[PDB]
Design a binder for these strands. Structure first.
Ligand SMILES: Nc1ncnc2c1ncn2[C@@H]1O[C@H](COP(=O)(O)OP(=O)(O)OP(O)(O)=S)[C@@H](O)[C@H]1O
Ligand SMILES: Nc1ncnc2c1ncn2[C@@H]1O[C@H](COP(=O)(O)OP(=O)(O)OP(O)(O)=S)[C@@H](O)[C@H]1O
Ligand SMILES: [Mg+2]
Ligand SMILES: [Mg+2]
Lengths: 113, 186, 370, 375, 546
DNA sequence: TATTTTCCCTTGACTGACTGACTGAA
DNA sequence: TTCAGTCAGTCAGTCAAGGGAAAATA
């Protein structure tokens, strides 16, 4: 029964949660900043500026060094390339709408551990 | 609508008073042709409808000539139709390219003479500037003659200095009181 | 020496195969076992390897193929149309004259963007039904590869998934860094090889090196970035500098993480800086609402007439030209006058960039602060 | 020759290493307009005598032109015609053509400039060029030249990240040293240095572009030698020349800098030492009234006629000529109708003219616009 | 016959020209003379236009010469460009100006067939091949090297304002990079303010181009000096006709076409209404027509009011009057204030209005003039005298020669006396001499109403005061056709308007036909550009407001 | 090159809150 | 002469249709 259970939960389950778990530190901070901004506002779309400000605040809270805009843009591009978000960052830069590609409860369940 | 069209038993109050003006302005037909043959075109602006005057003019004068009439008041006319009538039936041939071909044809031969009658030039179907450009290039030729009429208060806005430079316009105050019975579609 | 430089250039830049593998024991074992099954036997299978870019997806296949007949490699960028793919397949299989085989599909996700996914559907059908043994493995960066496919092609798609994540901690990253910058045992000069290994050993525990490693670990665990870092660091080694030093790694780390927007702003001129300060003021007063050239020009005129010196009395054409120049670098995007312009910068970035500006006067600084 | 460029040059030369060595697949250079991304790399690749193919993205507006020009230049450097249609065919032909002896164990470079257009050509072309060393596997390096930072070249899917590089911002000393080198042999180097110094002091505030600045210097030089030719001033009269030349440069800043006056006319000069107006004024006054910041607004013909009658204290009969004259202006782009609901019934017009032109027009016929424009 | 559910139904010259039984033969002589005169007019006008266009093209050719002088290590060389219905022929002439002089290779392009760079280059290379496959600028350079083995290429963009901005930018950018290997020259056609250029070509792109600008009242002054101020042409006009023509030209539109049109309309009306227009021709033809005249023609000559008061004498009067007026214009234009007038038009108007002797106001400045002005004016007068031969004023030329050769106050006073005696001696109003009305026409209302008619004024007159053309005492301070009743009642919901119209039409007198008349009036009003139905009331529209 | 569909931006009337002139102090 | 309560006259927020150029298809 163990073999069948492993097969069924390895070939059917979604891999978003463990992909979030294995993500880097700055990526986790970016996710936390987006979640906090959404809690403040309640909308499913937000520009890059508010998320960047929330991320600066969270980095100051964590004691991390001051992050530049280009580094945040690179992190966002990497996150988009794996479709964890939805964005069109090719041409517009500071005014990018960012949407969660998965449910918020899954993100919280991944980030609680 | 039909009930109104059927009822036409009314009679004008001043009968002979209006009748005399008809001849008063009919006396100008010879002057009209005198002007028109020498490189001008004639426009009618007045309160009453000129269709009666146009009919009398075509009966009295437009008999021994090649003439084509445009009923611009019809709600379904466009310049393509008049171009088709010119090329297919007036000419024995069997829209910009068509206009170029017609201009070239009349440039080739000066033996063809046409009288272009336009009952209404300011109708909603011919208020476009490009259509007026086409008609101006047509009537700019010395082998086409133009009699036209305008009734809109804001009519002259339709053409500009270049377009009015194309038409060698001549004006004629003809203030009849004829009703617009045929023109009004109700 | 030239030999070690050539060896490392071949190691990092070309990403040539290497014997040492990191945290992929189970995945590579399974992949090579399946390849052996599909080679020694007639069974056909289909596998997708999903991972973030630069995580060494290519290496697994490139090494398990060596663990093992014709192979076909298809990249989504070269063949964009089904006719091109058919031409390449016919030419590579040496059956062009006529008209088990291994299919390798790089950039698999793009193949889901075709008009009918005909190539993928046919490959799935022949894998599932045809007696000829065919093995198909695709490379994937998107985590939603299961939703870009049609229902039927998904039905025939065997759900064999490999996940290449960077599931290793910081001390393991330290071990990886130590091992990656080590000469092998095949080098001609052996005493220098041992001394080089001793030097990299010593560099391993230097805490200023640990600063660089922690920083670039927070940025990106992707090994491609680390290889780029090592190559850039190695570029600063010649005969006069026989060994690498922690200061070199600090220099490389700083050179890898400099912001471009601040540099561009540092590249601007006086009038551009003044216009940007006026732009920041207008954006502050009008919270997140657009503007045009006239309001900015009036604000600038007010500043120069009232607070600034009588010098810098510039007309309208020069300010319009400066606005055109700023629009040319795509720092200002429309939503020519009376046009709803907007800004593409952050306030603190402008402040920091002005902090480094060489010849910034004092009145302009006060205006920026005020 | 390259001046004040020794950091990036040495970095690049170290990057190349040896001919049989391997290098980066993609290096992305970025900077400002005249930063030097083109002269430096061209002089470097000419000095090193390496196989490099120079390509302009503006000229090759089509993919086929780009690939065929690349292939023809490469074949000409190696040494009839090669024509390819897709990227895959170009890759195959490149693998076929690089097998020459002289192109066997050397790095072949594909220099691109004005690459800002590559993002607007096709979706997959840029990733194809980024991963060229993987696909061709023939010791290939490709450079990128741009004025936009790499942040705006990133596709959504992500690709092979090039190594980013910045060419440095210039300075007063660097700019003068670049300028103070190509001196006219007919006068002193100190004279040229002083000329560059005063030119920078006048113009560096806004016009930092080295190309524009050198063009301005070339244009402005002949006026500067007149004081010493006529003998009224000596070569040591710094203050005298400054006073003589400063207003001339200040005026050239207003005129030549915007190129309102053609250079030929500039050099020649220095060597030689009715009812339409009222309709337009009424239109303008009606447009800017119920801020000048928010822009004009459309107005109907009724108010235009009313304003025109009110302004003119004379009997202006509403003839057809004035009606046609109104619409004779909209064809000069000085007006614009909006809505196109009807062509004759109440044509609303919007007046797209500047204030200075209106003021000059009013000055022509002795009328004041200002007194009617504040409310 | 002409009414159905379809919109297109189709059903000697002198006989039309002459309708009165007065004289047909004199009528057909008048018509031929009129046609000959107008042919001469048109020929001379064409000569003037040709001369002006050649004058412009000379300057353009010289500009191109100086531009290509530069083409004869790049050191920042730019692209030479020159900014410049009838236009179709205009540039056509330019072609013959350029092909015969500058280069054998010149092409024209139409914005209708240049949507992208590909079509632009394809058409350009096709035209280049005619003037003798994914082409490029390298293809152009290779072709140029093949054919020339120095002459540049000229491209005519006859409607630059209609091109695509991207195509222009790309073409200029790619062209500037190959000036060393492929010469290019551009000629833009512009019929608007040149500032539009800066709104299409960005300054970054525009920095690559060296632009030159190349091009109304002067035209009219010159043509009127060569039409009416010349003695050769026999027919002339009176004061008011000229005043109306000028006051429409320099007030309504700076167009000379309608001025020439008014000239020919005046000529036609004068030759149509007046039989004695047969009388006036060139002097030999005039006399030979004089010799044989019908009795009724002699009757008409006998009844002329100018004759009741009382040709060669009038003609010599004109030939001396025009020279004296030219001298007066030379005098007036010399003054810095220009009191009498700026152009010859105002000089002739003020000389013809009345006996000029502000006249003393101008003489006041005349009294305080310097010596060099006198010398220059005398030299100009002498060259004017030498310009025209067959002079009846040779003795005056000798006198002014004596005046000038002597070269304080008395001499200037004497020469002022000489010129004042001249202007008193020759210039006069024309109607003072008899038999003027043969040559002259004046029906100001006819021409003025024909050329610049007023539709709105006529409509308002018809709709407000029907008595103006219906002479039955219908108005002197209600009893009018219902059209006027409705229009006046407008200056308005339909129910109240209909009730008021019904009560008014009953006061002026089963009656259901009043409703029918109301409907007809409303419909005919709607057909005119007056009203449009609204929803605030049953209908409330006031487009007129006048 | 010709034909058919979609939501964004313009016009307009319905609706509910707002505030200028008035009064009285200080 | 500017700052507190009143009211009448004012003013902006709010709920719908439809034109029309971009988008899609042949
Ligand atoms: N498990 C591993 N064992 C050994 N080297 C690894 C491992 N994972 C990554 N690498 C290194 O990662 C380097 C870069 O990997 P790449 O081959 O460029 O990535 P990739 O597999 O091609 O992925 P993409 O998305 O196709 S670009 C190689 O030089 C390897 O040495
Ligand atoms: N760093 C430099 N050192 C010396 N001369 C330079 C330098 N940069 C520019 N120049 C000179 O200026 C000219 C024009 O500058 P470019 O080299 O074209 O600058 P660029 O970075 O290529 O910008 P673009 O793409 O040409 S607009 C060159 O031809 C050189 O003569
Ligand atoms: Mg790979
Ligand atoms: Mg360059």
């Amino acid at each position: 029964i163990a073999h069948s259970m492993e097969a069924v939960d390895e070939m059917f389950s979604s891999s978003y949660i463990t992909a979030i778990k294995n993500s880097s530190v700055l990526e986790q901070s970016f996710l936390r900043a987006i979640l906090a901004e959404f809690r403040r506002s309640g909308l499913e779309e937000a520009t890059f500026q508010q998320i960047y400000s929330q991320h600066v605040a969270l980095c100051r809270m964590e004691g991390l060094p001051y992050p530049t805009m280009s580094e945040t843009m690179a992190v966002c591009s990497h996150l988009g390339s794996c479709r964890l978000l939805l964005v069109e960052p090719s041409r517009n830069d500071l005014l990018l709408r960012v949407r969660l590609n998965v449910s918020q409860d899954d993100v919280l369940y991944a980030l609680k551990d | 609508q039909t009930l109104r069209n059927l009822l036409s038993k009314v009679s004008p109050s001043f009968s002979a008073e209006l009748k005399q003006l008809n001849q008063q302005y009919e006396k100008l037909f010879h002057k009209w042709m005198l002007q028109l043959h020498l490189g001008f075109n004639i426009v009618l602006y007045g309160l009453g409808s000129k269709r009666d005057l146009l009919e009398r003019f075509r009966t009295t004068m437009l008999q021994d000539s090649i003439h084509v009439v445009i009923n611009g008041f019809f709600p379904g006319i466009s310049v393509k139709s008049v171009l088709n009538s010119i090329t297919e039936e007036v000419l024995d041939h069997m829209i910009l390219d068509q206009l170029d071909w017609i201009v070239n044809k009349f440039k080739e031969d000066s033996s063809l003479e046409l009288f272009l009658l336009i009952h209404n030039l300011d109708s909603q179907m011919l208020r476009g500037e490009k259509s007026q450009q086409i008609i101006g290039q047509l009537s700019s030729l010395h082998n086409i003659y133009l009699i036209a009429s305008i009734d809109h208060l804001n009519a002259p806005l339709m053409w500009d200095h270049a377009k009015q430079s194309l038409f060698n316009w001549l004006w004629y105050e003809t203030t009849t009181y004829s009703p617009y019975t045929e023109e009004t579609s109700y | 020496l030239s030999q070690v430089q050539r060896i490392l250039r071949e190691r990092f830049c070309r990403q040539s195969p290497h014997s040492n593998l990191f945290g992929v024991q189970v995945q590579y074992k399974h992949l090579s076992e399946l390849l052996k099954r599909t080679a020694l036997h007639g069974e056909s299978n289909s596998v997708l390897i999903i991972g973030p870019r630069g995580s060494g997806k290519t290496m697994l296949i490139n090494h398990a193929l060596k663990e093992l007949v014709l192979q076909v490699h298809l990249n989504g960028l070269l063949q964009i149309n089904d006719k091109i793919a058919l031409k390449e397949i016919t030419r590579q299989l040496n059956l062009e004259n006529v008209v088990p085989v291994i299919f390798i599909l790089d950039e698999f996700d793009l193949f889901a963007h075709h008009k009918n996914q005909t190539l993928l559907y046919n490959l799935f059908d022949i894998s599932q039904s045809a007696q000829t043994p065919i093995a198909v493995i695709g490379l994937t960066c998107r985590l939603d590869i299961l939703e870009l496919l049609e229902k039927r092609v998904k039905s025939r798609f065997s759900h064999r998934q490999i996940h290449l994540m960077n599931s290793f901690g910081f001390p393991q990253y330290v071990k990886i860094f130590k091992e990656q910058l080590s000469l092998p045992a095949e080098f001609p000069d052996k005493v220098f090889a041992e001394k080089w290994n001793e030097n990299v050993q010593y560099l391993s525990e230097d805490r200023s090196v640990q600063e660089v490693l922690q920083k670039h670990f927070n940025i990106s665990k992707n090994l491609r970035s680390l290889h780029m870092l090592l190559m850039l660091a190695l570029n600063r080694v010649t005969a006069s500098h026989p060994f690498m030093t922690a200061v070199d790694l600090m220099e490389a780390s700083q050179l890898c993480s400099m912001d471009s927007k601040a540099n561009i702003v540092h590249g601007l001129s006086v009038l551009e800086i003044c216009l940007i300060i006026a732009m920041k003021h207008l954006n502050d007063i009008y919270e997140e609402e657009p503007f045009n050239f006239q309001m900015v020009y009036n604000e600038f005129q007010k500043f120069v007439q009232r607070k600034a010196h009588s010098v810098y009395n510039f007309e309208k054409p020069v300010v319009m030209k400066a606005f055109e120049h700023l629009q040319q670098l795509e720092l200002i995007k429309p939503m020519r006058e009376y046009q709803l312009m907007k800004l593409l910068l952050d306030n603190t970035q402008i402040m920091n960039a002005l902090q480094k500006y060489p010849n910034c006067p004092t009145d302009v600084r006060q205006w920026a602060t005020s | 020759v390259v001046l004040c460029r020794e950091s990036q040059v040495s970095i690049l030369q170290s990057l190349f290493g040896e001919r049989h060595h391997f290098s980066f697949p993609s290096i992305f250079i970025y900077g400002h307009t005249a930063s030097g991304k083109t002269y430096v790399t061209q002089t470097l690749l000419k000095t090193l005598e390496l196989p490099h193919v120079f390509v302009n993205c503006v000229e090759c507006f089509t993919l086929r032109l780009l690939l065929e020009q690349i292939l023809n230049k490469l074949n000409h450097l190696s040494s009839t015609e090669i024509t390819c249609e897709t990227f895959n065919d170009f890759v195959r032909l490149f693998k076929q053509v690089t097998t020459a002896e002289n192109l066997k164990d050397q790095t072949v470079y594909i220099v691109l400039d004005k690459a800002e257009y590559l993002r607007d050509m096709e979706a997959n072309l840029l990733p194809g060029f980024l991963r060229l060393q993987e696909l061709a596997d023939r010791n290939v390096t490709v450079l990128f030249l741009s004025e936009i930072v790499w942040e705006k070249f990133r596709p959504n899917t992500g690709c092979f990240e090039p190594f980013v590089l910045y060419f440095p911002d210039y300075s007063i000393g660097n700019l003068q040293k670049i300028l103070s080198h190509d001196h006219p042999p007919e006068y002193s180097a100190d004279f040229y240095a002083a000329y560059i110094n005063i030119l920078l002091g006048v113009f560096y505030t806004v016009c930092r572009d080295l190309k524009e600045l050198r063009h301005l210097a070339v244009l402005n030089f002949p006026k500067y030698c007149e004081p010493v030719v006529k003998g009224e001033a000596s070569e040591r009269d710094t203050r005298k020349l400054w006073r003589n030349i400063e207003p001339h440069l200040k005026k050239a800043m207003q005129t030549v800098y915007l190129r309102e006056i053609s250079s030929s006319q500039w050099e020649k000069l220095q060597k030689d030492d009715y009812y339409s107006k009222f309709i337009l004024i009424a239109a303008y006054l009606a447009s800017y009234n119920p801020n000048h910041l928010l822009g004009p607004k459309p107005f109907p013909l009724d108010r235009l006629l009313a304003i025109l009658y009110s302004i003119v204290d004379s009997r202006v009969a509403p003839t057809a000529n004035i009606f046609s004259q109104i619409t004779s202006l909209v064809t000069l782009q000085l007006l614009t109708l909006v809505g196109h609901d009807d062509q004759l019934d109440g044509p609303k017009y919007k007046c797209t003219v500047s204030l200075d032109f209106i003021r000059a027009i009013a000055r022509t016929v002795n009328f004041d616009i200002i007194k009617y424009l504040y409310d | 016959t002409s009414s159905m559910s379809k919109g297109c139904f189709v059903f000697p010259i002198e006989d039309y020209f002459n309708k009165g039984k007065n004289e047909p033969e004199d009528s057909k002589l008048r018509f031929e003379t009129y046609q000959l005169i107008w042919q001469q007019m048109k020929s001379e006008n064409e000569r003037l236009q040709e001369e002006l266009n050649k004058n412009l093209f000379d300057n353009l050719i010289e500009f191109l010469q100086k531009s290509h002088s530069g083409f004869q290590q790049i050191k920042l060389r730019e692209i030479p460009t020159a900014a410049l219905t009838d236009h179709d022929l205009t540039f056509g002439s330019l072609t013959e100006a350029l092909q015969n002089n500058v280069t054998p290779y010149v092409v024209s392009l139409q914005a209708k067939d240049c949507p992208d760079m590909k079509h632009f280059l394809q058409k350009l290379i096709s035209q280049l091949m005619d003037c003798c496959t994914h082409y490029s600028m390298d293809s152009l350079s290779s072709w140029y090297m093949t054919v020339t083995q120095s002459p540049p290429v000229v491209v005519i963009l006859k409607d630059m304002e209609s091109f695509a901005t991207k195509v222009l930018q790309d073409f200029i950018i790619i062209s500037s990079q190959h000036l060393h290997e492929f010469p290019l020259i551009l000629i833009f056609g512009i019929a608007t303010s040149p500032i539009i250029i800066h709104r299409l070509l960005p300054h970054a792109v525009s920095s690559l181009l060296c632009i030159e600008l190349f091009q109304c009242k002067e035209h009219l002054t010159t043509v009127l000096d060569k039409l009416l101020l010349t003695t050769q042409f026999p027919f002339k006009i009176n004061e008011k006709v000229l005043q109306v023509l000028t006051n429409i030209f320099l007030y309504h539109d700076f167009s000379v076409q309608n001025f020439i049109k008014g000239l020919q309309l005046s000529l036609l009306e004068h030759f149509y209404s007046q039989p004695l227009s047969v009388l006036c021709c060139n002097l030999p033809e005039a006399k030979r027509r004089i010799n044989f005249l019908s009795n009724n023609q002699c009757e008409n000559i006998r009844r002329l009011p100018s004759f009741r008061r009382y040709l060669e004498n009038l003609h010599v009067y004109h030939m001396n009057y025009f020279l004296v007026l030219r001298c007066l214009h030379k005098f007036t234009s010399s003054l810095p204030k220009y009191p009498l007038g700026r152009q010859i038009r105002e000089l002739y108007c003020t000389c013809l209005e009345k006996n000029i002797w502000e006249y003393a106001s101008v003489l006041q400045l005349l009294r305080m003039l310097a010596k060099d002005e006198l010398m220059t004016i005398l030299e100009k007068c002498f060259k004017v005298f030498k310009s025209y031969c067959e002079n009846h004023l040779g003795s005056t030329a000798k006198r002014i020669e004596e005046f000038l050769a002597q070269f304080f106050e008395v001499l200037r006073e004497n020469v002022v006396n000489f010129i004042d005696c001249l202007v008193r001696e020759y210039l006069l109003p024309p109607e003072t001499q008899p038999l003027h009305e043969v040559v002259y026409f004046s029906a100001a209302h006819a021409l003025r109403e024909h050329l610049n008619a007023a539709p709105r004024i006529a409509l308002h007159t018809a709709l407000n005061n029907p008595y103006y053309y219906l002479k039955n005492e219908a108005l002197k301070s209600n009893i009018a056709p219902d059209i006027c009743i409705a229009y006046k009642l407008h200056l308005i919901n339909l129910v109240d308007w209909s009730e008021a119209f019904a009560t008014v039409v009953t006061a002026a007198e089963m009656n259901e036909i009043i409703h029918a008349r109301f409907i007809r009036a409303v419909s005919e009003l709607e057909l005119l550009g007056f009203i449009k139905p609204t929803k605030q009331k049953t209908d409330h529209v006031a487009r007129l407001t006048w």
